[PDB]
Structure 1
Amino acid sequence: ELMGKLDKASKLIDEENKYYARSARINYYNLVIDHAHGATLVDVDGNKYIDLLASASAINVGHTHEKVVKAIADQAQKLIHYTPAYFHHVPGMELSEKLAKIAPGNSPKMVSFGNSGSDANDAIIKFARAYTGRQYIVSYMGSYHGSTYGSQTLSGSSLNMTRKIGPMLPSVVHVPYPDSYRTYPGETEHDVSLRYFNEFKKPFESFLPADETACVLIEPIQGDGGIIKAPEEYMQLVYKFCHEHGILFAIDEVNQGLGRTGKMWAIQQFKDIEPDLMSVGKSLASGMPLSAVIGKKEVMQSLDAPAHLFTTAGNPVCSAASLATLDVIEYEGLVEKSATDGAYAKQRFLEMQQRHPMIGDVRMWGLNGGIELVKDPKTKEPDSDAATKVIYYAFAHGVVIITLAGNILRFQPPLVIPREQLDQALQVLDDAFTAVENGEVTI
């Protein structure tokens, strides 16, 4: 009877499925969105929903923000596109300057635009190789960096990102990302840091010369990996190791940047780290396609054209949408709001944890959380069946939420989400856990 409510959607999707490749979408629900605003979504059948996904953190300023809508409309009347690969336009020039300056740290930076976070990570590999003269790249297990052949190789969060499409880009080595939940009994944060740093070093102590490694790319908090934040001390060791060996230290801020964590950049959750290179995307232009690689000037001067460029990257309408997006973040104080509401949301989920033992771990840094569900607190066996039931319930009760790794609830609403609506959604999740416990949810 939920299917009675999704009649136009179901019929649209059945036809879409005949034309649109199945590898292009991770399927959860029959949700065909007609319009949206803020944290509210409306489907083609008229159902309304609170967005706790923000399109995978691409909608930090909320849907259809009036400043961004106007920026897009106004720019499109003047110039829809001229490629910055050849020429110049004012929105692109203002934005590239602004990005260089608001990027973390005070060393002089330069920028190159792309369309996607994926291509910004391809760029990280190019610039690191060119600047250093070295070929090897280190990235993490559990990472997500995108879907172009460079970024895809770096990634480690899906087997379907490797199957059937190899050989991948050569000279990439994956190391394990610090997991602070499934630890050895008794380990402190210090023990975890040292153990993962020990694993980090083992390739460098065997087959991988540190002196031929161009860069380490790391998510300061892993997004698709499950909302997992590296310990402070682990990050400082990696940082120092890179500096000591002449390896560039690169970050991926595509998911966790632009105020998601309650600082501007996820890397600001750590003390005094300035990356050599960083990728930005997702929220940058409120979901219009735009990305950037930002790096220390000298690194960004290591390539000649046309080593890294795209016809529609730095599109003027996208750039205008991004200038408006950044202004909203600043004017509406969304970095601070993320920190405030994240602290609140954490406390709420931790209280839910006391009553709902299926909740193994609550990870939250700003309005940005992973709620991990396990069958048992000692074995920490993932309970994906429970998580699916929770999200299916939420969906049927007007709350859009998805999972990471099968058993982790992904919590990334628009940073603008009104308290009232955040509380409504949180109550719906409480109800969902209760309902699942009483076996009342049927897939």
Structure 2
Amino acid sequence: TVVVTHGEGPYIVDVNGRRYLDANSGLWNMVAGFDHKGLIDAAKAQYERFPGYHAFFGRMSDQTVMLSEKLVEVSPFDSGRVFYTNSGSEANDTMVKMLWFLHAAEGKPQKRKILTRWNAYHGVTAVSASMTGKPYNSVFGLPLPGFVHLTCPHYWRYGEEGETEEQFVARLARELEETIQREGADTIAGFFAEPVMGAGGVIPPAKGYFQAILPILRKYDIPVISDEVICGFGRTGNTWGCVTYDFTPDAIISSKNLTAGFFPMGAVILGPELSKRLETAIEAIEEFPHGFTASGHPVGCAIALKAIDVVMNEGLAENVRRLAPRFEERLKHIAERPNIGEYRGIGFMWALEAVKDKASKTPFDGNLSVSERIANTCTDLGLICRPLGQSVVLCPPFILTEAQMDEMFDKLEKALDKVFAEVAA
């Protein structure tokens, strides 16, 4: 119903000039707001320069070359190799295929299974949707065979009666051990994890989770991939979610924030060990992988170069670190409400989960659509937030000021007051 032609800073603006503070950042990607001038100028400069091309082995744009070097620099790796795609979904599919390719070239073509977690979201294509752990995919007859979903490490939801957080983490470690021993380590191509789960509802992992599961994966030679599609470039208060949870992955998947939302592109940064192994495989078999044609775009790459520079050198990632404590403190105050079951998140990605009864964690009945009601009321009050399950998510642009932060929570709290009073009746 609302006609929107553009945005201004962190606001979506309708044709009448009403401003809606956008706590979805567009599609969880507009870190620099909707009209950032340096980003817009960089997009334009590249169209005038070289508006399109495709990267091949031995032939690519100067933009591809520069962004590859910049991504290795800002990755946790001292060296590595980069390729590009059009989206996070394609980046995940291609990473999976590269592992299949690699393990097959290494004489283990049965090493195919992919481990993810329930509530993970990796994309919308057949493979990345099979990696995804959501009920809605049953309507497609997904997941495909060989996509194994581990329990989601969301302690609040999945911890058993009297189970402590430490015990929960030991149980997930046991479960991983057992899944590996049952399936057979030789048949498992890789494990992919968003450090903090995004579309699953903004779920940081229980304390110690990555510290417990990484030694296990390493023991069994199962490559570890960090999906940074949402966490990447500063949203969790370090450049990468995997830094924030101190695990060293074998490769990184990136998108969204990579271009500050101004251009659809994906990137896969391969760390030193997978790069060395791929290089040796390709050398050994004496040809380039048949059918590999993944590429981004020179305009996407130029805009990404500018996005990285803005986020890192013009104060945006720093704004997230400085405002993250005030962000959390205000959430903590909101979670005092009887109908807020918990708040969770880190950096500039958070969620609030609605409950009908706090002590027992009982949700409101599905048909009441409490999340949607909250989200609709926020829109009426000039705030946009995403309803996910029984939660509402705040993932606002990194350019958010303290005043716009207050503005966001003032509106949100007025919406919660109204919705909770109204469903109470």
TM-score by length of 2: 0.90
Q: How many residues align?
A: 404
Q: Is the 8 A contact 1:340 1:366 kept in 2?
A: no
Q: Name the Cα RMSD after superposition.
A: 2.0
Amino acid in structure 1 at the alignment position of 2:202? I
Which residue of 387, 392, 406 corresponds with 1:403? 387
Query: What is the deviation of 1:32?
Result: 3.9
Is 2:150 the partner of 1:175?
yes
Q: 1:93 aligns with which of 65, 81, 84?
A: 65
The one-letter amino acid of 1:172's match is: F
How far apart, in 2, do the equivalents of 1:348 and 1:185 lie?
29
- The structure 2 residue matched to 1:220, chosen from 177, 181, 195, is 195
Instruction: Name 1:372's counterpart in structure 2.
Output: 353
Contact 2:204-2:345 within 8 A present in 1 as well: no
Which of 29, 32, 36 is equivalent to 1:61? Answer: 32
Report the Cα offset of residue 38 of structure 1.
Answer: 1.8
Give the aligned residue type for 1:211: D
1:204 matched residue in structure 2: 180
Which residue type is aligned with residue 296 of structure 2?
G
The answer as to whether partners of 1:435 and 1:441 remain within 8 angstroms in 2 is no
Structure-2 change in CA distance of 1:242 and 1:440 (3 Å): closer
Match of 1:13 in 2: none
- Alpha-carbon deviation of 1:330? 1.1
Whole-Å separation in 1 of the counterparts to 2:114 and 2:372: 36
Query: Quick one: which of 407, 411, 414 aligns to 1:431?
Result: 414
1:413 aligned to 2:392? no
- The TM-score with structure 1 as length reference comes to 0.86
Deviation at 1:401, TM superposition (A): 0.8
Q: Out of 354, 362, 365, which is 1:381 matched to?
A: 362
Aligned partners of 2:137 and 2:143 also within 8 Å? no
Query: Quick one: which amino acid aligns to residue 294 of structure 1?
Result: I
* 1:232–1:270 CA contact under 8 A, matched in 2: no
* Match of residue 298 from structure 1: 276
Equivalent in 331, 345, 358 of residue 349 of structure 1: 331
In structure 2, the CA distance between the partners of 1:299 and 1:382, relative to structure 1 (3 Å rule), is: farther
| Letter paired with 2:117 | Y
The corresponding residue for 1:127 is 98
Aligned residue identity for 1:348: R
- Once the two structures are TM-superposed, the CA of residue 300 in structure 1 deviates from its matched residue by 4.5
CA distance in 2, matches of 1:162, 1:45: 42
Alignment of 1:55-204 (within 5 A): 55-85=26-56, 87-106=59-78, 108-132=79-103, 133=108, 134-157=111-134, 159-164=135-140, 166=141, 168-182=143-157, 183-204=159-180
Contact kept, 8 Å, 1:56 with 1:255, in 2: the verdict is no
Change (3 A) 1:71 1:388: same
Q: How does 1:272-283 map to 2 (within 5 A)?
A: 273-283=247-257
Aligned to 2:285: none
User: Tell me, what secondary structure is at the counterpart of 1:318?
Assistant: helix
Q: Partners in 1 of 2:97 and 2:329 — Cα distance?
A: 43
Once residues 181 and 168 of structure 1 are traced to their aligned partners in structure 2, the CA distance between those partners, rounded to angstroms, is 26
Contact 2:177-2:216 within 8 A present in 1 as well: no
Q: 1:56 to 1:299 in 2, by over 3 A?
A: farther
**Aligned residue identity for 1:404:** L
Aligned to 1:18: none
Question: Could you tell me the percent identity over the aligned residues?
Answer: 27
The amino acid that maps onto 2:115 is: V
> Is the 2:12–2:19 contact (alpha carbons within 8 Å) kept by the matching residues of 1?
yes
Letter in 1 for 2:254: V
1:40 is matched with 11
Q: Which runs of 5+ in 1 are unaligned?
A: 1-9, 11-30
CA distance in 2, matches of 1:167, 1:432: 37
Q: What is the rounded CA distance, in whole Å, between the counterparts of 2:423 and 2:189 in structure 1?
A: 53
Which letter maps to 1:101?
A: E
| Match for residue 337 of structure 1 among 319, 323, 330 | 319
